[PDB]
Amino acid sequence: GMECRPLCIDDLELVCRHREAMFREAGRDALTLAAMQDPFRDWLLPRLADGSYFGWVMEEGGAPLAGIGLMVIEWPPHPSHPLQDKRGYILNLYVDPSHRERGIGQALMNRAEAEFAERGIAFAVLHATEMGQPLYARMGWSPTTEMSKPIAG
Amino acid sequence: GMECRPLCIDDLELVCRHREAMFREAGRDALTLAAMQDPFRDWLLPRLADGSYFGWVMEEGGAPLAGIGLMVIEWPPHPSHPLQDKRGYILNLYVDPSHRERGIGQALMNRAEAEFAERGIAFAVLHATEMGQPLYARMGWSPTTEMSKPIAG
Lengths: 153, 153
Ligand SMILES: [Mg+2]
Ligand SMILES: [Mg+2]
Ligand SMILES: [Mg+2]
Ligand SMILES: [Mg+2]
Ligand SMILES: [Zn+2]
Ligand SMILES: [Zn+2]
Description:
2 copies of one chain form a homodimer. Chain A has a single domain (1-138), classed as Gcn5-related N-acetyltransferase (GNAT) (Aminopeptidase). Helices cover 37% and strands 30% of the residues of chain A. The first copy, chain A, contains 4 helices and 7 strands; from the N terminus they run E-H-H-E-E-E-H-E-H-E-E. A 5-stranded mixed sheet of chain A has the order 1-2-3-4-5, sandwiched between helices. The longest helix of chain A is centred in the N-terminal third of the chain and has 21 residues, at 30-50. The radius of gyration of chain A is 16 Å and the shape is globular. One magnesium ion (MG) binds at residues 8, 10 of chain A. It is classed as transferase. Keywords: YP_295895.1, Acetyltransferase (GNAT) family, GCN5-related N-acetyltransferase, Structural Genomics, Joint Center for Structural Genomics, jcsg, Protein Structure Initiative, PSI-2, transferase. The assembly is dimeric.
């Protein structure tokens, strides 16, 4: 059957694979993801260790098919969370391509949101792929007013 | 004349005033901003002190008319900055209502972006108000795929 478990330190490679696959499928350049590979792994390692990167893995008979990441990031108190100097952040949601008609992505999102609730977090954000956006909207997520610009990059 | 200067620790109250005015004018609830007031001030104080919140003030004959804030936040290496575990963040841009036809907002944005360039930052983000958005777009800023959801808030 299908079971969910918390991420652990031994999931380092899994998370890196999920991140790359998610971005590749969303149309990011393979060479850019190759440049990101080692920097991301080096970033993730200590944060799995100290729990600042947490999340959940969905497994079929013990084999990981999907994963999600979550963080609680420092943020200035804000009208969406006037009393809190933090917000939730969801990242690296990836579901195996042959297992996308089973509610896995929604199940992992539910686990992530529930974890934020348990932690008393007022407000959360994520950066969607075009593929994920309809699910997030269905689940009560709204587009923000964020904008971006390359500076030296 | 009009002169720009770096923010200093004595600008604590100025920055808090700018933040409130910016959000009020953007249509955020006055009561919510009132709830944010003390938490935000307490958050800002040590960060002005240590430079993690930096920025610039525009003055007319020594009287502050406008300000902008900038931070370099921790972030996982990402396809928009594959080699860097950080991104630039711009916040609290406010211009006195009687001085909005003078290019001040664009001038402060230019100073902020140049500061990020000096610091070798690859990529930056901001959260726009509807009022600011046309300027940012003119200045080469693009909407992101960020979405948000209240959790316990
Ligand atoms: Mg283990
Ligand atoms: Mg954002
Ligand atoms: Mg001073
Ligand atoms: Mg964002
Ligand atoms: Zn299966
Ligand atoms: Zn004047």
